[PDB]
Design a protein around this ligand. Structure first.
Ligand code: MG
Ligand code: MG
Ligand code: MG
Ligand code: MG
Ligand code: MG
Ligand code: MG
Ligand code: MG
Ligand code: MG
Ligand code: MG
Ligand code: MG
Ligand code: MG
Ligand code: MG
Ligand code: MG
Lengths: 196, 244, 232, 244, 242, 248, 221, 204, 196
């Protein structure tokens, strides 16, 4: 699989997501964004089988956009994640299941907390301080378990992450061509200008 | 209230279904047609009016066969009659496909019966504009039936319907009384020709072609066949001399 | 007067189906067409009707297979449905059974098709009449279809406005034309004559006359324009 | 066919009104009055039963007040049976929202769907509208206490106080005169009853002819409580308003 | 008023189409009656053959529904046959599904529920008929059950249907007031037929040849109709008591 | 071909729904039935109206068991009742027993019936039912209850009431007599009086049908061995049991 | 599982063990396998235990309804026909194997039904993993014209064969007796040969033995 | 490959005197990989408690679903559902999916508010009522639970003694299962009240 | 199983063994494989029990209905109906059926419908696993127009051999005799037929 990480610090949620897309023998691209913004303060990253990942995300996106317009209001990150889980849970008993895993990072304006949700292709959802999909957890959870504090600043979060990506570059057979990083905070969503 | 006669499944207050009654008028208004049971078969005959000399003689055949052993003939709205036979043919095929044996005539009567009665049940459909005379030879011998737009049907010794029906009915009543012992198939054919010629005299104004068929155990082998050539001629002769 | 003409599922107290009778009235208002046959050929001849002096002449003859076709008088779209339905039956007979479809059977199929619309709520009946000609395994044939469902086999006939003329002529011409065997052109000239006892205030041009013929060693084919100057 | 019997329930009059809706509203005007009043710290729902015998069982009766949800209730005016259909589909809409989003359903969202349902009966399928008007009282945390109304046309609107059913012109006027925004809930309770005293066509207003309910975030904890008053509680409140 | 044309309520709370369907039942001008023996059930029906061209053997308002159930119909034949077929189908399907022969009273109940539906739904018309079912039920003994176009049904000690129904009924009411029991006290069905014909001749004031009647008989485990000859036997027996 | 996909019950300009009104008229014309609620039971009762004395009136149940603890009776068109009983028994299984493994409580089963009735008041191509039902039952968390269901679909609970012909008279008569300390035997006594006014023919156990929702009847269970299943609370009275009481 | 059915001269009796197992584990030591289809028609199941419950509930219900419609006591042969037609429809995917016995107005009856929808009639029958032990006993002792008390003794012995010799069964013996005259008699734990001995020790803990991080009171209200 | 063994987890319930107890581990796994220690598998609907082991997506879904149905139930019966009835509900709801089922092992516990009886029950994945007064177990260490329970349990434990027992039964079983542990929670249920405790355990 | 039907002068006789096996276990040693579908039309069942019972139950239904409407059906009609079920459902049935009956027009008739649903009318027919062992014996001993007692013997001896050799056949021998006279059931026990 590709790399899908996320971490919830004190005032925001950081999503790190691999840039490579490879089709068998060649690496087709080294600059791919594995996220969609679902609403101004809600970000979804994703990974899994080709086509399915994007189709699914863009469908979730349009649904949340529809909701926002209709109610002139932005759903809580908790609600978005329950909606997404339910969609994935329908997929599994469907004729052709969506094979997609996602992380949802949001800033909840009403409670002024950041929230991270991990949901796999079966509809298994869980709220966590840090998470990952596929093998990404295997390399990085050791380090997060050790270093994570709930009161970390965004800067600390980004350091702790830098360390995680280094561990992945070192021990992981695949060249995932770096990561794109985004931050979701009370003022919305922005992308870290460079992960050098 | 009034207008009990505008809709088809409706009972008037005297208990009646006026649209079926009106369909009978469409029948009374058709040409004459008849059935005669002989004592191993049956004979059908029908007056074909000749509108014009431009009709091709021989060639507008009004008697229809069902399966191999059943003849139908009908007076009234001709396309309705044809529609009814198409149904009859599906029914006989289904019955035979499942039960192997060609459909027994009573069984087949009730098939038409139920389908016709069915068109008096609903206002979204219109009753059949024909009386149908039919029959053939089953494993219990010969049977002749007649079937009205209401889905009433019974067995007959003879039967008639259309404009000529009263002169024909009177004439058939003769035969019954003046042949209590039964009538042979070949004699029943000639009588049928006579009876059509007699019933034609309601509207001599028009010229007509005669058509006859028979299903007889000995003569056609329990299969339904049209009468033609010499035998047809011989029965038209018998009809000419019986007029003078 | 006449609550009984509101649809096709209603019989009148005399026993009539008014909606059907009103459909037959569309035919009489249509432009005239004539059909006739010998033992070797069958011929349609048709008078086409234009709207303006600026307009086309609506075609009245439609080919249905190599051995069969028809002319229409009345609601044109309706002929288009029926002729198409027929093309399919001619086709189905060829593909499945490798058999040219007999004219008698096409007759019966059209009858059964029209009859459907006259027993069911919601269906109007067809508003067109048709003359069909064909050459099949028993030689030349001509049929007249009415939207009541009645089809009748004839040596000749006509339908549409003033057709009573062409029909009376055919009744008298009968024994002349019935024997125009192995002669396509004579039989056409005898059809064109017929169709003339039917024109009021206009005569046949190159633009308004169409003709079709079929028979032994001659597939159903249609002449118009220059092709018809020959006989006008 | 059967289009003769079809009184077309979905058409416009030449003025552009929908016959059947107008007529259902007429129907509703003869139903028991119902009232909703919203305070800054709660909501009151009050309604008048259709004159009820002395033998009727008033404890288990629930003709006009219904729980949709732990946080939303309705007062009905019109056909009870029609309403219970609607109530029930709404209870389910709430559950579906709750199950999809793990969040209780916002009041408007519910009201809108239920009104969208009534609207459909008004535009397709030839059935008769639902002869019901609804007052909805609810709490959510996007707009706190809320009060809405809907009728057979599918239209809905929000209110600080409102009535449906009998004598609403009269009752609307009287609230308009006495409502103030700072209003506390026990003020609203009192106002609700004054209004029905004046409004009722029956010469007295007694406990056995009322249904009554409140929605309080009161008292200590931020949670919301729904109370449907029993006969004895309503009698007490009537003494305490010296309306008895 | 279209409340006259379809099965909806008049302002009096009435279904005129149902009323008019009852009226149609009498169109044949046939009377019928049924009675119960010790272990049989008999039905009797007039048989009229106005036309000389009809095959008489085909003219019947009595049906063998199943091995055990007989039905006689008061009303026009097309509707009779439609109801016959239906009941045949139902009785056979019941057996297949539940493993035993469909009982008279249950079949009556079912056929009545079908009628009830035509009274409630608009595109269906009621049938113009009255069905009288008879059997010897294995649980209930000889039984008679009657159904009409209202959707109504009840069991009977004995019963009669048709134009002259009233005459026949009062005649029978009287007989049982005397006899004090609900059945003909007779072992043999041949004499319960005799009773039935007799008590009918007296009520209609009219005499019968062998071609004027139809008879049906339900014994335990068979329902059958009689031929002109087994009837003739009965008419001779009656005549031996002048 | 069901063309009739439109309502046959519509609003008149005055706000009436004629067909529901007319159904109520059919009910009013029907034979009197009634029900009354005691503390340890409920009784429902009506008059058998033998159409011939040749008919066997035992074969006409006007009073029907719906579940072991719930019974019904009606005024109006009996056929409409017969098929509502079939329908109600079935819905008690499909929409309750098959799910929760216990029979529905009285009020819920009444909703279901009411609902069926409403549907015939609004759906395409049908008329409403021409009956009113009184339904009586017992369930563990609500105890004894008595409901009336009308053609409109509306229902309401009662301490006692009556429907059909003599109902205004009888409702008056029941108001005099009903108290909240009535024991079941006493309510039966009253039911019999209240019926007796409304009837001038023979009045006894053969012309009267009557059932109770009472104590559980283990003698009517059919099996023994499960101490947790006690009999049905519902029971029709015998021709005898009735006459017995026509002494008091 | 061991279940059997034995006719006697005035009726019929069925019996069953009380063990139910998931693989080699015993999930329930006292499971009741005797199911009622209607008061005088009972049923015992083997196979998938969710399928035998489901299908006895369902047919029980259709029977009750059909009984109410017909105003007749329900017949065994109806339970039989309804069961078999449903099992057949599902081609054996409903893993229900049953012995159904009862009394109706036509007399007393005993049938078995296999998952695919075949049925047997007999005077004595067994099914389940314990089937062959039980049948050995029935084949050894059954005689015609058993009295009731002999039939119970016999059916009880047959199940014991299964309990002892089969690992699929059992613990106790349940019995239902359906006699033509009477109410059906259901004897839960008619026989209980298998009581656990007192343990060598009590394992009640001293309180406070367990480590804890949090207490909350929980909201029912 | 086995859906009942991907996420892991256990639930056990037993009865005491006028009380019942019910408990679960807290581990959400994904095979070898521990994912969460805050996956409670015990839910409640009024005073009825439902433990669910098995595939976690389905645990979640079923809970969402029984919350939905017990909501509609309360709204119509105007009273909270009792355990005997809920059990039937669970059972019928699972058997609706007979040929495509939810991969779970439910357990019901509660006290009937009318009768006062302690009640517990369990089921297979297609919904056969495994009904037992003493105790019920479910999950990836159901074997080890059966063992602890059969030894430890004795009937009629007072609430504070029942707690000690069920706690021990759970912990020592989870410790012999790779795929359970990571914390644990125990509900003790009496007629009028309920106390919920988190247990200290090993984290490996 | 072993089953046969044989036409003789006065009508026709059907016989069968009475054993039902599931592998080597004899599930039922007193099976009735002679099954009535009309008064005087019966069949012999072989193949799957579920399939043949279910089919027979349907045929009986169809002929009950035939009878209600058209009177008594021909033995040929009954074979048509079996055939139609067997041919049209060949992909999920394992049923090998012999049909036999008597009427006055035709005396005894025997039709056999093997797997696949072909139908075959014959003077006699044999089937079931046990039949293979007696093709020789039967072809050698059947003659047309035997008496009843001759025919009961021909059957008794044919099936005693089929039983002797086939493990999936055994128990009692049942017969059903079909003639103008009515319907006679017969039974023969081991101590009789083993000894032949
Ligand atoms: Mg789902
Ligand atoms: Mg799966
Ligand atoms: Mg004119
Ligand atoms: Mg709706
Ligand atoms: Mg939703
Ligand atoms: Mg009993
Ligand atoms: Mg159990
Ligand atoms: Mg759901
Ligand atoms: Mg409710
Ligand atoms: Mg399924
Ligand atoms: Mg085979
Ligand atoms: Mg099949
Ligand atoms: Mg075999």
């Amino acid at each position: 699989m590709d790399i899908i990480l996320g971490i919830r610090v004190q005032d925001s949620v950081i999503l790190a997501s691999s840039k490579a897309v490879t089709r068998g023998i060649s690496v087709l691209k080294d600059s791919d964004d594995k996220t969609r913004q679902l609403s101004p303060h809600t970000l979804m990253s994703f990974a899994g089988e080709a086509g399915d990942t994007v189709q699914f995300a863009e469908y979730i996106q349009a649904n949340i956009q529809l909701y926002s317009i209709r109610e002139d209001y932005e759903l809580s990150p908790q609600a978005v994640s329950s909606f997404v889980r339910q969609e994935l849970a329908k997929s599994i008993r469907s004729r052709r299941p969506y094979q997609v895993n996602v992380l949802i990072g949001g800033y909840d304006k009403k409670k002024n907390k950041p929230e991270l949700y991990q949901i796999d292709y079966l509809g298994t959802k869980v709220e966590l301080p840090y998470g990952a999909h596929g093998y990404s957890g295997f390399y990085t959870f050791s380090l997060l378990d050790h270093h994570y504090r709930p009161d970390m600043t965004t800067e600390e979060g980004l350091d702790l992450l830098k360390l995680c990506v280094q561990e992945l570059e070192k021990r992981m057979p695949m060249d995932f061509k770096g990561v794109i990083v985004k931050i979701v905070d009370k003022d919305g969503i922005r992308q870290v200008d460079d992960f050098q | 209230g009034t207008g009990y006669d505008l809709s088809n499944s409706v009972f008037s207050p005297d208990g009646r279904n006026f649209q079926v009654e009106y369909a009978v008028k469409a029948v009374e208004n058709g040409t004459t047609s008849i059935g005669i049971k002989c004592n191993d078969g049956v004979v059908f005959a029908v007056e074909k009016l000749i509108t014009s000399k431009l009709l091709v003689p021989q060639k507008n055949v009004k008697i229809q066969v069902v399966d191999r052993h059943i003849g139908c003939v009908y007076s009234g709205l001709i396309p309705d009659g044809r529609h009814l036979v198409n149904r009859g043919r599906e029914e006989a095929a289904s019955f035979k496909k499942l039960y192997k044996t060609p459909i027994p005539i009573p069984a087949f009567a009730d098939r038409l019966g139920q389908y016709v009665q069915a068109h008096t049940l609903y206002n979204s459909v219109r009753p059949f504009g024909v009386s149908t005379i039919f029959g053939g030879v089953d494993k219990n011998g010969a049977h002749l039936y007649m079937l009205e737009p209401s889905g009433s049907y019974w067995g007959y010794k003879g039967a008639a319907t259309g404009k000529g029906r009263q002169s024909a009915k009177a004439e058939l009543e003769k035969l019954v009384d003046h042949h209590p012992e039964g009538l042979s198939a070949r004699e029943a054919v000639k009588q049928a020709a006579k009876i059509i010629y007699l019933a034609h005299e309601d509207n001599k104004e028009k010229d007509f072609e005669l058509e006859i068929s028979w299903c007889s155990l000995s003569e056609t082998n329990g299969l339904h066949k049209f009468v033609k050539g010499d035998l047809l001629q011989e029965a038209i002769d018998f009809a000419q001399k019986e007029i003078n | 007067r006449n609550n009984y003409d509101g649809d096709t599922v209603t019989f009148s107290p005399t026993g009539r189906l008014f909606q059907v009778e009103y459909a037959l009235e569309a035919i009489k208002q249509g432009s005239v067409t004539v059909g006739l046959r010998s033992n070797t050929h069958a011929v349609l001849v048709a008078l086409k009707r234009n709207a303006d002096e600026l307009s086309s002449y609506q075609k009245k003859i439609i080919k249905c297979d190599e051995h069969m076709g028809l002319s229409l008088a009345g609601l044109a779209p309706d002929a288009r449905v029926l002729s198409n339905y027929l093309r399919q039956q001619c086709n189905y007979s060829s593909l499945v059974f490798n058999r040219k479809l007999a004219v008698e059977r096409a007759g019966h199929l059209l009858c059964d098709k029209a009859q459907k619309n006259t027993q069911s709520y919601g269906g109007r009946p067809y508003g067109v009449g048709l003359l069909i000609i064909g050459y099949d395994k028993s030689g030349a044939h001509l049929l007249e279809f009415q939207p009541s469902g009645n089809v009748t086999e004839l040596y000749g006939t006509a339908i549409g406005a003033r057709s009573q003329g062409a029909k009376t002529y055919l009744e008298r011409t009968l024994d002349t034309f019935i024997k125009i065997d192995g002669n396509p052109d004579e039989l056409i000239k005898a059809g064109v004559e017929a169709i003339s006892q039917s024109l009021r205030d206009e005569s046949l041009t190159v633009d308004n006359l169409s003709i079709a013929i079929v028979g032994k060693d001659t597939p159903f084919t249609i002449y118009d324009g220059e092709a018809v100057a020959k006989y006008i | 066919g059967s289009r003769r019997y079809d009184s077309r329930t979905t058409i416009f009059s030449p003025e552009g009104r929908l016959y059947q809706v107008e007529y259902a509203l007429e129907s509703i005007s003869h139903a028991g009055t119902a009232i909703g009043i919203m305070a800054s710290d709660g909501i009151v729902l009050a309604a008048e039963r259709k004159v009820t015998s002395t033998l009727l069982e008033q404890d288990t009766s629930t003709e006009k007040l219904y729980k949709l949800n732990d946080k939303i209730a309705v007062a009905v005016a019109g056909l009870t049976a029609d309403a219970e259909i609607l109530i029930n589909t709404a209870r389910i809409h709430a559950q579906n929202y709750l199950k999809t989003y793990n969040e209780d359903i916002p009041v408007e969202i519910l009201v809108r769907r239920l009104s969208d349902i009534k609207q459909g009966y008004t535009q397709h399928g030839g059935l008769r509208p639902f002869g019901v008007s609804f007052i909805y009282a609810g709490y959510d945390d996007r707009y706190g206490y809320q009060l809405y109304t809907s009728n057979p046309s599918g239209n809905y609107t929000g209110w600080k106080a409102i009535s449906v059913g009998a004598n609403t012109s009269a009752a609307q006027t009287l609230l308009q005169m006495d409502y103030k925004d700072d209003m506390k809930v026990d003020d609203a309770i009192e106002l609700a009853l004054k209004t029905l005293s004046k409004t009722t066509d029956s010469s007295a207003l007694t406990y056995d002819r009322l249904e009554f309910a409140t929605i309080r975030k009161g008292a200590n904890d931020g949670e919301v409580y729904q109370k449907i008053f029993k006969p004895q509680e309503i009698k007490d409140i009537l003494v305490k308003t010296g309306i008895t | 008023g279209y409340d006259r044309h379809i099965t909806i309520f008049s302002p009096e709370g009435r279904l005129y189409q149902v009323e008019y369907a009852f009226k149609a039942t009498n169109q044949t001008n046939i009377n019928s009656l049924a009675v119960r023996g010790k272990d049989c059930t008999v039905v009797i029906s007039q048989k009229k053959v106005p036309d000389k061209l009809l095959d008489p053997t085909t003219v019947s308002y009595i049906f063998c529904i199943s091995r055990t159930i007989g039905m006689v119909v008061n009303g026009p034949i097309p509707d009779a046959r439609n109801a016959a077929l239906r009941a045949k189908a139902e009785a056979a399907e019941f057996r297949y599904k539940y493993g035993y022969d469909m009982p008279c009273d249950v079949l009556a109940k079912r056929m009545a529920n079908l009628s009830q539906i035509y009274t409630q739904r608009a595109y269906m018309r009621p049938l113009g008929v009255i069905l009288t079912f008879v059997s010897v039920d294995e649980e209930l003994g000889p039984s008679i059950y009657k159904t009409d176009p209202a959707g109504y049904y009840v069991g009977y000690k004995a019963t009669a249907t048709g134009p002259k129904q009233q005459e026949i009924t009062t005649n029978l009411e009287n007989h049982f007031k005397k006899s004090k029991i609900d059945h003909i006290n007779e072992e043999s069905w041949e004499k319960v037929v005799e009773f039935a014909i007799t008590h009918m001749i007296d009520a209609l004031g009219t005499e019968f040849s062998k071609n004027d009647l139809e008879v049906g008989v339900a014994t335990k485990d068979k329902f059958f109709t009689l031929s002109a000859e087994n009837i003739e036997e009965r008419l001779v027996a009656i005549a031996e008591q002048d | 071909t069901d063309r009739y996909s439109f309502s046959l019950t519509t609003f008149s300009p005055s706000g009436k729904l004629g067909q529901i009104d007319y159904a109520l008229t059919a009910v009013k014309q029907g034979v009197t039935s009634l029900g009354i609620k005691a503390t340890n039971g409920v009784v429902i009762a009506t008059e058998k109206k033998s159409s011939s004395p040749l008919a066997m009136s035992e074969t006409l149940s006007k009073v029907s068991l719906l579940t072991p603890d719930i019974g019904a009776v009606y005024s109006g068109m009996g056929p409409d009742y017969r098929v509502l009983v079939d329908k109600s028994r079935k819905v008690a299984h499909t929409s309750y027993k098959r799910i929760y493994g216990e029979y529905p409580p009285t009020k819920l089963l009444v909703s279901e019936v009411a609902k069926i009735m409403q549907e015939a008041t609004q759906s395409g191509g049908v008329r409403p039912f021409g009956v009113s039902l009184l339904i009586a039952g017992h369930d563990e968390f609500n105890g004894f209850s008595l409901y009336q269901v009308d053609p409109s679909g509306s229902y309401f609970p009662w301490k006692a009431t009556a429907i059909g012909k003599g109902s205004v008279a009888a409702k008056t008569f029941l108001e005099k007599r009903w108290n909240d300390e009535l024991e079941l035997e006493d309510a039966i006594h009253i039911a019999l009086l209240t019926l007796k006014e409304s009837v001038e023919g023979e009045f006894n156990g053969d012309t009267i049908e009557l059932a109770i929702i009472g104590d559980e009847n283990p003698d009517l269970l059919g099996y023994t061995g499960i101490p947790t299943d006690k009999g049905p609370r519902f029971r029709k009275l015998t021709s005898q049991e009735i006459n017995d009481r026509l002494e008091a | 599982t061991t279940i059997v059915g034995v006719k006697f001269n005035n009726g019929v009796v069925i019996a069953a063990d009380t063990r139910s197992t998931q693989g080699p584990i015993v999930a329930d030591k006292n499971c009741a396998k005797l199911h009622r289809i209607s008061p005088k028609i009972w049923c015992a199941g083997a196979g998938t235990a969710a399928d035998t419950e489901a299908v006895t509930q369902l047919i029980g219900s259709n029977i009750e309804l059909h009984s109410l419609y017909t105003s007749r006591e329900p017949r065994v042969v109806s339970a039989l026909q309804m069961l078999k037609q449903h099992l057949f429809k599902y081609q054996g995917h409903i893993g229900a194997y049953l012995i159904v016995a009862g009394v109706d107005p036509t007399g007393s009856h005993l049938f078995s039904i296999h998952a695919h929808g075949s049925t047997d009639v007999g005077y004595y029958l067994s099914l389940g993993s314990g089937s062959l032990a039980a049948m050995a006993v029935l084949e050894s002792h059954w005689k015609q014209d058993l009295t009731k008390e002999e039939a119970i003794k016999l059916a009880s012995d047959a199940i014991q064969a299964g309990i002892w010799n089969d690992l699929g069964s059992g613990s106790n013996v349940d019995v239902c007796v359906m006699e033509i005259g009477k109410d059906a008699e259901y004897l839960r734990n008619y026989l209980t040969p298998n009581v656990r001995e007192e343990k060598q020790k009590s394992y009640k803990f001293p309180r406070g033995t367990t480590a804890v991080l949090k207490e909350s009171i929980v909201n029912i209200c | 490959s086995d859906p009942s063994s991907i996420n892991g987890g256990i639930v056990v319930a037993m009865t005491g005197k006028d009380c019942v107890a019910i408990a679960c581990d807290l581990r959400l796994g994904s095979q070898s990989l521990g994912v969460s220690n805050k996956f409670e598998k015990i839910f409640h609907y009024g005073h009825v408690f439902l433990g669910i082991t098995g595939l976690a997506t389905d645990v979640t879904t079923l809970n969402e679903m029984f919350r939905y149905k017990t909501n509609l139930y309360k709204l119509k019966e105007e009273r909270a559902i009792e355990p005997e009835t809920f059990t039937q509900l669970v059972s019928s709801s699972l058997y609706e999916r007979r040929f495509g089922p939810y991969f779970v092992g439910p357990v019901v516990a509660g006290i009937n508010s009318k009768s006062g009886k302690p009640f517990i029950a369990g089921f297979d994945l297609i919904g056969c009522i495994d009904e037992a007064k003493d105790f019920i177990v479910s999950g990836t260490a159901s074997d080890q639970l059966f063992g602890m329970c059969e030894s430890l349990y004795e009937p009629n434990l007072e609430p504070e003694d029942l707690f000690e027992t069920i706690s021990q039964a759970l912990l020592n079983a989870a410790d012999r299962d790779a795929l359970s542990g990571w914390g644990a929670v125990v509900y003790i249920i009496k007629k009028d009240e309920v106390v919920k405790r988190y247990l200290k355990m090993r984290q490996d | 199983t072993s089953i046969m039907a044989v036409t003789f002068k006065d009508g026709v006789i059907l016989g069968a063994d009475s054993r039902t096996t599931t592998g080597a276990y004899i599930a039922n040693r007193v099976t009735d494989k002679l099954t009535r579908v009309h008064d005087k039309i019966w069949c012999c069942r072989s193949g799957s029990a579920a399939d043949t019972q279910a089919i027979a139950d349907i045929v009986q239904y169809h002929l009950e209905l035939y009878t209600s409407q058209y009177g008594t059906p021909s033995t040929e009609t009954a074979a048509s109906v079996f055939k139609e079920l067997c041919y049209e459902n060949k992909d999920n049935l394992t049923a090998g059926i012999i049909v036999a009956g008597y009427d006055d027009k035709n005396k005894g008739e025997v039709y056999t419908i093997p797997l696949g649903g072909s139908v075959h009318k014959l003077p006699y027919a044999i089937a079931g696993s046990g039949s293979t062992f007696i093709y020789g014996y039967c072809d050698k001993n059947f003659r047309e127009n035997m008496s009843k007692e001759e025919t009961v013997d021909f059957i008794k001896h044919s099936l005693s051999q089929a039983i002797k050799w086939d493990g999936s056949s055994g128990g009692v021998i049942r017969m059903v005799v079909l003639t103008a006279a009515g319907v006679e059931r017969l039974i023969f026990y081991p101590d009789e037929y083993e000894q032949l």
